[PDB]
Design a protein around this ligand. Structure first.
Ligand code: NA
Length: 551
């Protein structure tokens, strides 16, 4: 430890500079200086180590200088105090800081190593050998604290590719701990995992990062979840597929909630009926971590009467309350109708050359009739949630849409196909048998507005639904088979409907003011319904194929 050995170490290194022209002697003096320095490594002052490293650099002794720094580092902290003080988080700042002085010198050597060899080719040159020996010392070192400080240095430089090709396990430990605190380092870890074909772990990083309290925008959190769902939908080696689908499910649920929050935040900020003093606080609370469905509903979607987003929340939350779901559909239908009606009015004023109210901006292109806009809102939710949902109870929802169409005159008086409710549900994929089942119930229970002469339209709906049904049976060539199927009950319904029609004709002929004008319409509809009943009876009286529908 004492002074003579140190002086003789410096003496050898001095003589080495004087013998640069004699390569065997230069190499021997340098090794001897290194040997003596390592003997007194625990006692070397920062200034002595610095001068020695500088002279070693001048003589191209890169690897030996680094080995000396690493030897000094361990000897001043043989208990590995800095490692434990780091794996935790104080007077052990003595052990870590003394080590870091050695580590900073190593950075110095490596910087000069690259500068002296920049623009030279990799038998290997002596420069290639010195590079190999120097980085063998660095990378084969067991000082994992040194490696942590080294990785931090590479990152501060932007030398990203050098981090990724590290074949050591210490770099995993380093990135995993700084991913919990900084968004940047978490990305390297995922880039580290995936290139090594480890997608599930990268999905776990991205997921916990999407759930973290770091500063991440909602839209960036959606990107992380979209990524994780993908990395967690394909199994990397050696993890139970029954745990893959676990992470894939979690990322999927969060992604669903996150998109509802994103659509909710986008609408609130753009809403003219929301005051600005509220919008800043809205963006502050929604553009960040993902909220609970309960909070998104009670504090935002419900208050704002965003009935479509409420229905998406009910779907995501497995909310079991058919009454609330149906009432929310009713509010969405009526809200959408009222909005579409006002845009039509303003458009019609422009077409007629009228005057708009002050400040009103009319649609520049023809806006949809109210039932078209209503249908669009229904279809948007259907394509987003699928019909396999509790927010699509056809038995309850189809009568609500049908009642809307009658009560609001969305019929041929505005140019609409009177059967648009039925075409809507059929085009969404609702099976024909279920639609006719609902329409059978509507015809038999006679609840307003499905009363009086308006039951003519209900028969029109039945005829249309059955027409499209037999056409689809003829197209497929087979009838798939208490899920309702085509049977005698359909034929009985069509027969029954004939009595409804003659009853409606009779009350029409005697209306106060003159006979109704739909006498021939009803007569033709009677013939149409009877023709459909023949087709149904022929399909049932036949033997044609009943066919397959696998799960
Ligand atoms: Na508004």
């Amino acid at each position: 430890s004492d002074d003579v050995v140190t002086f003789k170490a410096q003496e050898q290194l001095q003589r080495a500079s004087e013998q640069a022209h004699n390569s065997p002697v230069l190499r021997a003096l340098l090794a001897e200086s290194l040997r003596l320095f390592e003997q007194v490594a625990g006692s070397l002052t920062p200034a002595n180590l610095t001068t020695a490293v500088e002279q070693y650099i001048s003589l191209k002794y890169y690897a030996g200088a680094i080995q000396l720094c690493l030897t000094v580092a361990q000897q001043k902290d043989r208990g590995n105090t800095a490692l434990s003080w780091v794996n935790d988080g104080d007077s052990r700042k003595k052990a870590f800081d003394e080590r870091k002085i050695c580590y900073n010198l190593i950075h110095q050597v490596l910087d000069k190593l690259e500068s002296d060899f920049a623009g030279e080719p990799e038998r290997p040159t002596l420069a290639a050998t010195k590079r190999m020996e120097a980085y063998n010392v660095v990378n084969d070192s067991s000082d994992e604290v040194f490696h942590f400080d080294l990785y931090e240095w590479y990152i501060e430089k932007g030398w990203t590719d050098r981090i990724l090709s590290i074949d050591s396990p210490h770099v995993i430990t380093y990135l995993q701990r700084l991913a919990e605190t900084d968004f940047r380092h978490a990305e390297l870890l995922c880039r580290f995992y995936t290139t090594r074909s480890r997608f599930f772990e990268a999905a776990q990083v991205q997921t916990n990062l999407a759930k973290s309290d770091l500063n991440i925008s909602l839209k960036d959190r959606i990107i992380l979840l979209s990524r994780a769902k993908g990395n967690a939908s394909v199994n990397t080696i050696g993890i139970s597929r029954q745990q893959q689908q676990q992470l894939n499910h979690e990322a999927s649920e969060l992604l669903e909630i996150a998109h509802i929050q994103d659509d909710l935040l986008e609408r609130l900020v753009a809403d003219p009926r929301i005051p600005e003093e509220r919008k800043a606080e809205i963006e502050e609370f929604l553009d960040g971590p993902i909220r609970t469905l309960t909070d998104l509903f009670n504090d935002y979607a419900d208050q704002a009467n965003y009935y479509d987003l409420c229905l998406l929340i009910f779907h995501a939350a497995d909310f079991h309350n058919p009454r609330t779901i149906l009432d929310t559909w009713n509010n969405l239908i009526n809200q959408s109708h009222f909005e579409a009606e006002q845009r039509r009015e303003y458009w019609e004023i422009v077409q007629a050359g009228g005057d708009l109210p002050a400040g009103v901006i009319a649609p520049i292109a023809e806006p949809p009739l109210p039932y078209v806009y209503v249908s669009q809102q229904i279809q948007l939710i259907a394509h987003r949630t699928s019909l396999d949902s509790l927010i699509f109870p056809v038995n309850s929802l189809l009568p609500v849409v049908c009642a809307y169409a009658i009560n609001n005159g969305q019929d041929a008086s505005i140019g609409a196909d009177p059967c648009w409710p039925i075409q809507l549900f059929l085009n969404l994929g609702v099976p024909h048998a279920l639609v006719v089942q609902v329409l059978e119930n509507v015809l038999d229970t006679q609840e307003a507005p499905f009363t009086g002469r308006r039951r003519k339209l209900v028969v029109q709906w039945i005829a249309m639904a059955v027409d499209m049904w037999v056409r689809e049976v003829e197209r497929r060539g087979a009838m798939a088979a208490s899920e309702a199927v085509m049977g005698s009950w359909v034929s009985e319904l069509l027969g029954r409907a004939d009595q409804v029609l003659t009853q409606i004709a009779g009350t029409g002929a005697t209306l106060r003011g003159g006979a109704a004008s739909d006498a021939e319409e009803i007569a033709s509809l009677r013939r149409t319904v009877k023709g459909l009943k023949r087709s149904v009876d022929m399909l049932l009286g036949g033997e044609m194929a009943r066919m397959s529908f696998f799960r």
